[PDB]
Amino acid sequence: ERLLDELTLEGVARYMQSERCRRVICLVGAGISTSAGIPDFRNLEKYHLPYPEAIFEISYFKKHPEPFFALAKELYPGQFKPTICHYFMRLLKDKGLLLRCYTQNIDTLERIAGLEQEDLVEAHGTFYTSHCVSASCRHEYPLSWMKEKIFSEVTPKCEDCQSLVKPDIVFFGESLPARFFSCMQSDFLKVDLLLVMGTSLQVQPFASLISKAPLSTPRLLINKEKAGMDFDSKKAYRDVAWLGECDQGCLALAELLGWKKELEDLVRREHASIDAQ
């Protein structure tokens, strides 16, 4: 099927406004959180890492966790404040359009923006909660405990069994949560639109999600750069790229949908609430 009239942001907006477009899946990455003061993870010289990527690999981390926690100290934001892009997804939720948000991010900003547990697949886990790595113990630790360890530069260690404590993030080389595969098996059978934001789709198996949708499902990319997507060839029929920052892409789309005022009000009242804490 051909569902978009034209392969443009205006085309996608018209499609979203039509009765046909009922359920939208968002697929999001690091680019949706850069304007919230969280840099794209993709001083440390003193650790003499075998290569830079070892810092996020589970095998390296379990034996040498210090570089990761050193980086965590530098990356840790002074505040957790979701972006315009996060609040665009909140609008999708409130308008009954959000089937699911699959996130690569560990920053909890989707939760803070008001997406509920059931709205979310936190594909790479979360920094919010932490656990001892020992299967026979699994002692839980809260963010305040983890933050204290990070800022004091004391490696997190279990108070019961002395094992390493890690944030509940999926390190490279670890399995994704069962929820990722369970939701994937259902959500991509019947979805009207994929909204792919702030990701270059370089991390597997998350990147494979775009191919799981029906062949007729239109797909909009909002990202600083291009990404099995076809925007430009003579065979292009359903994929649209909008190139720039995620906040500005979501503002442009919101304006076309007639949501610009609603989105700006939402961002401002929610930011005010967070700043008042």
């Binding site: 990527e53 490279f172 399995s175 994704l176 595969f181 991390v203 597997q204 198996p205």
Partner: peptide, 7 residues
């Protein structure tokens, strides 16, 4: 299942 990988 497929582990988290850079590609």
């Amino acid at each position: 299942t497929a582990r988290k990988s850079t590609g």
